[PDB]
Ligand binder design. Structure first.
Ligand code: CLA
Ligand code: CLA
Ligand code: CLA
Ligand code: CLA
Ligand code: CLA
Ligand code: CLA
Ligand code: CLA
Ligand code: CLA
Ligand SMILES: CC1=C(/C=C/C(C)=C\C=C\C(C)=C\C=C\C=C(C)\C=C\C=C(C)\C=C\C2=C(C)C(=O)CCC2(C)C)C(C)(C)CCC1
Ligand SMILES: CC1=C(C/C=C(\C)CCC[C@H](C)CCC[C@H](C)CCCC(C)C)C(=O)c2ccccc2C1=O
Ligand SMILES: CC1=C(C/C=C(\C)CCC[C@H](C)CCC[C@H](C)CCCC(C)C)C(=O)c2ccccc2C1=O
Ligand code: SF4
Lengths: 148, 39, 33, 137, 148, 60, 739, 80
């Protein structure tokens, strides 16, 4: 994820841009990479806060879905943290109490319910953690250049 | 087996439970009557 | 009066840690307490 | 409340109706939408704010959709319960949950048009102390 | 000229290769638990690697700690100094500078290659290494990527 | 109890507490927990059987 | 080695685990080796005194630095346009541009601006000079010195109290209500009448002259003669100017009920009248009990009672409470788990009132202080509420005897344990499916360019409560808004003296008192209900399952905090009752963010004079990212820039600091031990095989952190970053803009 | 270090003693006239708390239990 930013911010700053017939190049961000890409706040300020303006303001336009896809990924990401941080022991106990309610109303299932395996819980998380991460910067990359 | 998991000692009508519930229910209808400007 | 901060800040950052960690380390590594 | 007014008196609703943003393929879908939302109450934004108080005047806001769900929802649950209990009598119960026996399910799915009539009829919904009680307390 | 395609095309393949490389390590372990025969692997290159696995990992652990301090810590030092109001103590281009002379060194060869080494070439292989600004319409297609 | 009869458990610290099941076998011996029982519902391990004492069981 | 004398087990550990676990359970006196109940209560009693000392010494610090390094004099002359400074700063690392940035609020050297609100509290209460603060600090130093001596005193054998003295419940409760609460409330009315209120009207009243000057021109005879109305005879005027004689009224006790116009704060005259009424009821409440004189109630008899006048009853409310008195007094965790809940609610009870009813002068206009105080107490309110269930879970484990209870309400609770856990799952699920989908329906439908189709529904019945207090903006004409109603004018006794002042404050709209609720306020209120339900579900489940559950029936044996039971039965990852506390605190923090983002964005629109941006854009979530989070963070990230450094450089550094700390916890949460201990074995091989480093060697063998330890370390990181991050945003966003 | 407690509900599966890596367990003859055998835990210092035996015991709830306690070099599995 740092490789794609090192490509994204540099080319916008140093390479990609508009050139005049005289020979003067006006890059997209104007050489901010030189002095701002040496501090973590500069990446937070000049790359994430600045270039994401088109995404949040995409509502009511053709790029409005990118604003949604940029956001729905954040949900899917934090949803990963359920399965990584937690453990099956909690979840099977909770399911046990819920099974009693179905036994009470005689809606008990034949296939007895079971919590997800330990390896699966780690698996389901990284699936969400990555899907939420990649899908986030996917829309941020799209809407930024599609406007610029 | 010292403690029964299930409770015992109550009849079908449940007079004591229903009496306090209807009171809590009546006051709820009262506050609604003030909201609807009935009173 | 501002000279007190010049003497109290460093001892809090240097002297007190060095004294506490040095005592605590030798205390926990002691064989008989 | 909260500076809530009817639609036509509100100038905001009058302006938003011009900017149609036709949803469907019909060209006049945008105008027909705003005209239909004239019945509701509009705030300073011009967006209709629905009152779910329970007023019979505003019953279409919450009351009518509310009943439409519960009739559908009880249809789904009552069908699933009867199909599940019906499977329990047969020999291999676990397999039918996966590979559905349509001979049993589709008659049950046909029913449920009147689930409350059947529901009140079953004063015994299977509840007893014979369930999973699961260490002493 | 289509800056949208270049980042998406660059970003896409960069992620695909990362996923596949991780799969290569997974199946390398699956081979071990399943198909590794000690009779076949007797004092070969593989058995000899398993027998000193501790030295391989312990030194790699040292490199990861060495770099992570001296790669991310420099950002922290610049972030700390810029907040302290000491912009001359940072690791920057005007302040203390860490120039990639070896990359600047290799860059210069490819610009001067079309003359001397592989002389049949007219232009440098890529204008990213060096040369002149190429302008398609108003957009710049590629230009020298300076390294600082 | 009789072999083959449907019986409920009262032994706590059991997966099938207050659950019905058939008696597969009964050991005519002095071993504690002689009666053998079988079930449809598995525990977490997947065993579908365990031995119980007669006092801990009420016939259904 | 014997580092932990409380544990022979940890001391006989060759690894470095002994160092970490010793830190953990060094405060757990119940687990200390050779600890009886008598020595237990005595050791706990002395520790309270030392903890009490740390409070007053910390209180002394606030007074010392504001006296030595604070512009309390200059702030009094212009409280609104002067920034209070907490303390000086001496960092050798600061460059010359930074020192110029922090030389703020008229300080010769660099200094930090204060945001606690003590300047408004010390000013309102009667302090007007820096030397007066020096006396408060020195007084608290000696006041703390008494407790530290008392704590050491009561550890000696002649002075060590007995266990029966500790178990005396009626006496402790009888004295606290009357003396601790009541007399302190009575005393507080004294300072307000003798010091604060006179100083508010310009009369200097210090220790030198409090005996000479009178609080009222009439003596103390109107109280004895029955002429109570003399004290409320002439009130302060609307044009009264604080700390001055202009518009000064002579009354000391009044019941105006509204806010002061100038300060936008409650009347000092009403606060003195308030605590006096409180002290009476509290003193009256004290004498109820049976302490020694034979007259009073026995809680044991009241709980174990089984009869009405003549009829049989199961107990109070026909409910059994046989062993509740013994369960309460004998179990310490029951009291602690109980008291933190009561204190946690009161902490939220504070915060809800401090922004609504500011009791200090010129504090509502100081927008940053008003926000930090609300965020402070609400964070604190939840740790106490979360800690309450943890000890409630611990009590069920170790301090609970089923035979002693045998049929009380507590035994009756746990018998339907499944219904409590089950229905809680319904409530949490029933909220989130429906609450989120409305945010999501509004997000999408606004994104497609049709905002009118948003599901907006007014918080109607909540308006009816606002209208039921006199707010006419909604036009419901309910009880206190309608003059014809009986509540507006009490027909038997026309004594509603509260009504004139109260109706002015609500219907003004200038202050924040029952602010205007809208459709955006609707959904966020239900989101809060989910955080409180789901956090309760986690805590209630583990607590009720603490003694046992299906996957681990014999959970009582292991204890509160154990890592697992093994890969058997396909699980056991997080089965303890400790892990329920663990997973709940994530919600308990998140539940604040929904509360504090709601507080911050709603107030920023009010303070800035733009109420629309909240009410308009708070329905769809994208407004929260764009209008609230994205925009307000502009000055923060620009704290230190390539061009220079402003006064907000600390918060930016703190903002990134919590981010790093928040992410460092993800390691201990995600990556678990078995990967790490293998890595440790390699480093051990290298050090034992590196030639020159063979000389130096560990005495304690290095091992990976335990499973429960890593959980502790991970959450502390998750929490610290959650705290410091929002703090820098809360302060810098409000302070840089000043509302 | 640890404590491995064996309860009355054993039936002599011999699965616990096999699953143990450190040979903490042993099957001994029981004085029960009709009871074939029963498990034992003679060398408890070598227990490494891996809970394999708890996974092996097929009773409804486990006849054998491993309660964690004071650690040492052997229990923590430290070759160093
Ligand atoms: C290399 C980075 C660095 C360093 C080393 C410092 C160092 C310092 N800064 Mg500082 N600062 C920095 C960067 C740095 N700054 C940056 C980038 C900014 C933003 C512009 C600031 C802004 C700043 C302000 C605004 C202030 C300081 C202050 C201070 C001093 C605090 C000393 C003190 O009270 O005791 C140490 C402080 C503690 C709180 C103790 C440690 C706390 C731990 C977490 C808890 C303690 C218990 C512990 C865990 C148990 C073991 C200990 C044992 C003894 C029991 C100290 C000299 C203050 C100052 O001037 O001095 C009064 C001050 O007010 N700094
Ligand atoms: C206010 C009253 C109060 C009292 C008297 C107690 C007392 C007790 N609690 Mg308790 N607790 C409380 C409130 C209280 N708690 C609250 C509010 C919560 C909710 C968070 C808890 C949650 C809780 C849990 C989950 C557990 C206890 C346990 C215990 C017992 C052992 C204490 C222990 O492990 O040593 C204290 C050891 C520590 C390591 C504490 C300090 C660690 C902090 C978090 C470090 C933070 C890092 C740093 C300072 C910040 C740096 C800042 C950065 C900017 C640099 C003890 C009886 C434990 C037990 O076994 O009970 C029998 C247990 O498992 N409590
Ligand atoms: C931001 C979060 C974060 C950070 C900082 C780390 C840090 C680290 N991880 Mg890691 N990890 C994380 C999240 C994080 N992890 C998450 C979320 C996961 C789950 C996927 C993992 C999973 C994981 C694995 C599986 C492995 C690591 C490894 C490592 C180490 C690599 C060595 C290195 O960079 O040198 C250390 C560099 C740093 C700590 C960076 C900051 C240090 C600054 C520059 C210095 C501090 C200043 C000063 C000294 C402070 C003094 C203060 C004084 C008052 C006490 C390092 C300790 C590897 C490891 O341990 O092997 C080496 C490894 O194998 N991690
Ligand atoms: C880890 C990355 C890193 C690096 C490389 C630096 C580097 C530096 N910092 Mg810095 N810093 C860092 C992280 C880092 N910082 C972090 C994380 C913080 C926040 C806490 C700070 C905060 C900070 C402040 C506040 C200040 C500095 C300053 C400095 C400078 C002076 C260093 C000094 O006096 O130490 C002296 C160093 C040594 C005595 C030992 C260094 C190690 C030697 C070279 C090891 C060599 C090993 C050898 C090759 C092996 C031999 C093999 C054998 C077989 C022969 C220097 C440029 C100062 C400054 O003003 O900067 C200009 C200063 O005041 N730092
Ligand atoms: C790093 C060393 C290096 C590399 C990678 C190349 C690479 C290349 N040289 Mg080259 N070359 C080099 C050094 C190098 N040269 C030196 C030192 C000389 C002596 C002047 C030459 C002289 C040379 C000639 C004369 C020709 C090449 C040609 C070529 C190309 C095709 C060769 C085949 O096989 C290729 C791009 C051929 C070409 O036409 O390039 C396009 C060709 O005809 N080279
Ligand atoms: C009248 C007699 C009397 C008094 C005054 C006290 C006073 C006290 N006892 Mg005590 N005690 C007594 C009789 C008395 N006891 C008797 C007879 C017994 C034997 C039966 C005991 C047995 C006993 C034990 C066993 C313990 C105490 C403890 C305490 C202390 C409680 C901690 C504290 O300061 O809370 C202060 C509490 C308050 C101020 C009230 C609660 C907080 C409310 C919400 C504040 C009001 C709201 C208001 C808005 C706050 C604004 C704040 C302002 C800054 C803005 C306190 C010093 C405990 C202690 O700390 O150990 C020393 C303890 O462990 N006592
Ligand atoms: C709330 C209603 C209420 C009721 C029903 C009673 C009823 C009773 N009180 Mg009582 N009491 C009350 C409020 C009440 N009290 C209040 C508010 C106080 C505090 C002033 C007291 C203080 C009090 C004392 C001090 C004593 C009683 C006693 C009694 C009993 C004679 C009788 C059952 C007496 C008793 O214990 O009789 C058994 C007794 O000695 N009461
Ligand atoms: C954004 C992150 C996130 C989300 C969404 C949830 C959501 C939930 N958690 Mg949770 N949790 C999280 C983070 C999160 N958590 C973290 C970080 C922790 C700390 C480890 C926990 C710890 C935790 C515990 C300890 C517990 C929960 C519980 C719950 C549930 C409460 C029921 C509820 O409110 O229903 C609302 C549910 C939702 C809003 C999500 C439903 C899914 C969506 C809306 C619909 C799905 C359709 C899908 C889009 C279409 C299919 C597409 C196809 C590709 C398959 C719910 C599923 C509790 C529980 O389950 O008990 C009932 C519980 O006990 N969680
Ligand atoms: C006996 C008696 C009576 C005589 C009473 C007389 C003649 C005097 C009694 C005076 C009293 C009762 C004085 C109270 C003294 C305690 C004081 C003054 C201080 C308390 C301060 C605290 C606790 C801490 C305050 C803090 C500090 C220090 C700060 O600086 C900031 C605020 C805060 C943090 C709160 C009368 C004739 C009536 C009846 C007969 C019996
Ligand atoms: C939530 C959670 C669970 C519980 C998760 C469960 C039980 C997921 C269940 C997902 C689906 C929704 C179950 C039901 C699937 C039905 C077939 C869907 C009905 C069919 C219609 C939709 C058509 C774990 O088991 C776990 C284990 C280890 C670490 C972390 C965790 C963890 O975080
Ligand atoms: C990194 C990591 C380790 C290895 C971490 C180790 C060995 C800790 C090393 C940290 C050293 C000791 C420095 C820490 C110093 C702290 C900054 C201050 C702590 C001192 C307080 C007591 C005052 C584990 O052992 C582990 C175990 C289980 C789950 C996750 C993990 C895990 O993530
Ligand atoms: S916590 Fe670790 S040992 Fe315990 S069940 Fe989970 S993965 Fe297995």
């Amino acid at each position: 994820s740092i490789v794609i930013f090192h490509f994204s911010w540099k080319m916008q700053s140093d390479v990609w841009g508009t050139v005049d017939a005289a020979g003067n190049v006006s890059h997209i961000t104007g050489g901010n990479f030189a002095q701002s890409a040496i501090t973590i706040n500069g990446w937070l300020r000049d790359f994430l806060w600045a270039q994401a303006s088109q995404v949040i303001n995409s509502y009511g336009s053709a790029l409005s879905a990118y604003g949604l896809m940029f956001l729905g990924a954040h949900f899917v990401w934090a949803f990963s943290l359920m399965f990584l941080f937690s453990g099956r022991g909690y979840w099977q106990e909770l399911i046990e109490s819920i099974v009693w309610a179905h036994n009470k109303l005689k809606v008990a299932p034949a296939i007895q319910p079971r919590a997800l395996s330990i390896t699966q819980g780690r698996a389901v998380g990284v699936a969400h953690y990555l899907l939420g991460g990649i899908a986030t910067t996917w829309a941020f990359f799209h809407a930024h250049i599609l406007s610029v | 087996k010292i403690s029964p998991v299930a409770n015992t000692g109550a009849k079908p009508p449940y007079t004591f439970r229903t009496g306090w519930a209807l009171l809590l229910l009546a006051v709820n209808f009262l506050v609604a009557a003030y909201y609807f400007h009935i009173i | 009066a501002s000279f007190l901060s010049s003497i109290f800040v460093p001892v809090i950052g240097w002297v007190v840690p060095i004294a506490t960690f040095s005592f605590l380390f030798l205390y926990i590594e002691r064989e008989d307490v | 409340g909260a500076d809530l007014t009817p639609c036509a008196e509100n100038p905001a609703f009058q302006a938003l109706a011009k900017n149609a943003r036709n949803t469907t393929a019909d060209p006049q879908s945008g105008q027909k939408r705003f005209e239909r939302y004239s019945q509701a109450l509009c705030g300073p934004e011009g967006y209709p704010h629905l009152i779910v108080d329970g007023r019979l005047d505003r019953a279409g806001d919450f009351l009518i959709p509310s009943i439409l769900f519960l009739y559908i929802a009880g249809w789904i649950g009552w069908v699933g319960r009867a199909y599940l209990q019906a499977i329990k009598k047969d020999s291999d119960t676990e397999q039918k949950e996966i590979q559905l026996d349509l001979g049993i399910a589709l008659p049950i799915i046909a029913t449920g048009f009147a689930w409350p009539a059947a529901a009140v009829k079953e004063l015994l919904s299977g509840e007893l102390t014979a369930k999973d009680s699961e260490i002493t307390v | 000229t289509d800056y949208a395609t270049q980042l998406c095309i660059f970003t896409h393949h960069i992620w695909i290769g990362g996923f596949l490389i991780v799969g290569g390590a997974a199946h390398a372990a699956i081979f071990m638990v399943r198909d590794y025969d000690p009779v076949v692997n007797q004092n070969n290159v593989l058995d000899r690697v398993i027998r000193h696995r501790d030295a391989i990992i312990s030194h790699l652990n040292w490199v990861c700690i060495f770099l992570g301090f001296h790669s991310f810590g420099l950002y922290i030092h610049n972030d700390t100094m810029r907040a302290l109001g000491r912009p001359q103590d940072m690791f920057s281009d005007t302040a203390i500078q860490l120039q990639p002379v070896f990359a600047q060194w290799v860059q210069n060869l490819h610009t001067l290659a079309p003359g001397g080494t592989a002389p049949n070439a007219l232009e440098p292989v890529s204008y990213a290494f060096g040369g002149g600004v190429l302008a398609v319409g108003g957009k710049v297609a590629m230009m020298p990527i300076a390294l600082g | 109890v009789q072999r083959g009869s449907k019986v409920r458990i009262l032994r706590p610290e059991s997966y099938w507490f207050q659950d019905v099941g058939t008696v597969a076998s009964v050991d005519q011996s002095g071993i504690k927990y002689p009666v053998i029982v079988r079930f449809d519902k598995v525990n977490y391990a997947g065993i579908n059987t365990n031995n119980f004492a007669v006092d801990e069981l009420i016939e259904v | 080695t014997k580092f932990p004398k409380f544990s022979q087990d940890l001391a006989q550990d060759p690894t470095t685990r002994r160092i970490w676990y010793a830190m953990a359970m060094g405060n757990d006196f119940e687990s200390h080796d050779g600890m009886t109940e008598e020595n237990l209560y005595q050791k706990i009693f002395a520790t309270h005194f030392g903890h009490l000392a740390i409070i007053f010494l910390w209180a002394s610090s606030l007074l010392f630095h504001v006296a030595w390094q604070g512009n309390f004099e200059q702030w009094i002359k212009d409280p609104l346009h002067v920034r209070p400074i907490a303390h000086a700063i001496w960092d050798p690392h600061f460059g010359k541009p930074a020192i110029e940035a922090f030389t703020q609020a008229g300080a010769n050297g660099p200094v930090n601006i204060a945001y606690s609100g003590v300047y408004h509290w010390w000013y309102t209460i009667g302090m007007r000079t820096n030397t007066e603060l020096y006396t408060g600090s020195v007084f608290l130093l000696l006041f703390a010195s008494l407790f530290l001596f008392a704590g050491w005193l009561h550890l000696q054998p002649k002075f060590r109290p007995s266990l029966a003295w500790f178990k005396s419940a009626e006496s402790r409760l009888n004295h606290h209500l009357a003396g601790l609460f009541g007399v302190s409330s009575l005393a507080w009315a004294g300072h307000l009448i003798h010091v604060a209120i006179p100083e508010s009207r310009g009369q200097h009243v210090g220790w030198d002259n409090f005996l000479s000057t009178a609080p009222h021109p009439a003596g103390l005879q109107p109280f004895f003669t029955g002429n109570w109305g003399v004290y409320a005879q002439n009130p302060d005027t609307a044009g009264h100017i604080f700390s001055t004689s202009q518009g000064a009224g002579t009354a000391i006790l009044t019941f105006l009920g509204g806010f002061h116009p100038q300060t936008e704060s409650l009347w000092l005259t009403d606060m003195a009248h308030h605590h006096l009424a409180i002290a009476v009821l509290f003193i009256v409440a004290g004498h109820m009990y049976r302490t020694n004189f034979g007259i009073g109630h026995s809680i044991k008899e009241m709980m174990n009672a089984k009869t009405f006048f003549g009829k049989p009853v199961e107990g109070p409310f026909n409910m059994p409470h046989q062993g509740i008195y013994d369960t309460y007094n004998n179990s310490l965790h029951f009291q602690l788990g109980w008291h933190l809940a009561c204190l946690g609610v009161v902490t939220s009870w504070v915060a809800q009132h401090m922004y609504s009813l500011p009791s200090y002068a010129f504090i509502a206009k100081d927008y940053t202080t008003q926000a930090a105080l609300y965020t402070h107490h609400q964070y604190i309110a939840i740790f106490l509420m979360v800690g309450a269930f943890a000890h409630g879970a611990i009590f069920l484990v170790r301090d609970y005897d089923p035979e002693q209870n045998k049929g009380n309400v507590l035994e009756r609770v746990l018998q339907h344990k499944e219904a409590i856990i089950s229905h809680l799952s319904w409530v949490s699920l029933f909220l989130g499916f429906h609450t989120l989908g409305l945010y999501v329906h509004n997000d999408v439908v606004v994104a497609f360019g049709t905002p009118e189709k948003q599901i907006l529904i007014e918080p109607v019945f909540a308006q009816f409560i606002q209208a039921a207090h006199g707010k006419v903006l909604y036009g419901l004409d309910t009880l206190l808004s309608n003059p014809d109603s009986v509540a507006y004018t009490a027909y038997p006794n026309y004594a509603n003296v509260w009504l004139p002042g109260w109706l002015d404050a609500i219907n003004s709209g200038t202050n924040s008192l029952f602010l205007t609720i809208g459709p955006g306020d609707f959904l966020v209120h239900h989101a809060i209900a989910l955080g409180l339900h789901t956090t309760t579900l986690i805590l209630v489940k583990g607590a009720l399952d603490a003694r046992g559950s299906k996957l681990m029936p014999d959970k009582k044996d292991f204890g509160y905090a154990f890592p697992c039971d093994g890969p058997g039965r396909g699980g056991t990852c997080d089965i303890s009752a400790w892990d329920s506390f663990y997973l709940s605190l994530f919600w308990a923090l998140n539940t604040v963010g929904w509360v504090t983002f709601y507080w911050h964005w709603k107030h920023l629109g009010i303070w800035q004079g733009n109420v629309a941006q909240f009410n308009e854009n708070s329905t769809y979530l994208m407004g929260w990212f764009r209008d609230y989070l994205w925009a307000n963070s502009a000055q923060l990230i620009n704290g230190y820039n390539p061009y220079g450094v402003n006064n907000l450089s600390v918060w930016a550094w703190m903002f990134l600091f919590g981010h790093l700390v928040w992410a460092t916890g993800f390691m201990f949460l995600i990556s678990w031990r078995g990967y790490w201990q293998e890595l440790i074995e390699t480093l051990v091989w290298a050090h034992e095989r590196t030639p020159i480093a063979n000389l130096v060697r560990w005495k304690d063998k290095p091992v990976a952190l335990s499973i429960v330890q890593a959980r502790v370390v991970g959450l502390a990181h998750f929490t610290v970053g959650y705290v410091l991050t929002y703090a820098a945003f809360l302060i810098a966003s409000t302070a840089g803009k000043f509302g | 270090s640890h404590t491995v407690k064996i309860y009355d509900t054993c039936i002599g599966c011999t699965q616990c003693v096999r699953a143990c890596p450190t040979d903490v367990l042993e099957m001994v003859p029981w004085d029960g006239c009709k009871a074939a055998q029963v498990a034992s835990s003679p060398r408890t210092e070598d227990c490494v708390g891996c809970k394999r035996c708890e996974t092996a015991c097929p009773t409804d709830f486990l006849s054998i239990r491993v309660y964690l306690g004071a650690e040492t070099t052997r229990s923590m599995g430290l070759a160093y």
